[PDB]
Amino acid sequence: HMCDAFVGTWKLVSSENFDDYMKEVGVGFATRKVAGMAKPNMIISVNGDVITIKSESTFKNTEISFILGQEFDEVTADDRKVKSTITLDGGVLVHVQKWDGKSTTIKRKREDDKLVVECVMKGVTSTRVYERA
Ligand SMILES: O=C(O)c1csc(Cc2cccc(Cl)c2)n1
């Protein structure tokens, strides 16, 4: 019952600062433009201790499966090869990515009927809001 309130199909309804977040991460111009136009659906499911997060859009379809607190290797939609760990901290899913001596954190929280995604790297934050599909 770990993530019950996150499970479901979610659609992007708003974004702020995502281009600048992507610049900070190191994403190149063409990828930023196409990725920034995407309107992904995020599909979260749980089977036993394994959580699966899928993101589907015209830009890219991604899927990660993981156990909380157990590191895994991830190829991000922008083609970084990162080492990721996802934990629950006070009801917030905290997804940390480490690569090339750098780090970024993606937090996912339930707030009212929304799922709010906050992405941070070195003072650059982006907030992306999803609603149930
Ligand atoms: O709400 C989302 O769609 C989301 C937040 S963070 C992330 C992962 C990422 C970072 C930089 C470039 C790209 Cl294309 C993807 N995807």
From Swiss-Prot:
Keywords (A to Z) from UniProt: Acetylation, Cytoplasm, Lipid-binding, Nucleus, Phosphoprotein, Transport
UniProt record, GO biological process: brown fat cell differentiation; cellular response to lithium ion; cellular response to tumor necrosis factor; cholesterol homeostasis; fatty acid transport; long-chain fatty acid transport; negative regulation of DNA-templated transcription; positive regulation of cold-induced thermogenesis
Tagged with keyword Secreted: no
InterPro entries for the chain: Calycin, Fatty_acid-bd, ILBP, Lipocln_cytosolic_FA-bd_dom
Residues recorded as bearing N-acetylcysteine in the entry: 3
KW Acetylation (keyword) present: yes
Effect of residue 24 to D: In a breast cancer sample; somatic mutation
GO MF, one example: long-chain fatty acid binding
A cellular component term, taken from the record's GO annotations: cytoplasm
Localization annotation: Cytoplasm; Nucleus
Positions bearing Phosphoserine: 14
Function: Lipid transport protein in adipocytes. Binds both long chain fatty acids and retinoic acid. Delivers long-chain fatty acids and retinoic acid to their cognate receptors in the nucleus.
Subunit: Monomer. Homodimer. Interacts with PPARG.
Family named by the database record: Belongs to the calycin superfamily. Fatty-acid binding protein (FABP) family.
Protein name: Fatty acid-binding protein, adipocyte
Lineage of the species this protein comes from: Eukaryota, Metazoa, Chordata, Craniata, Vertebrata
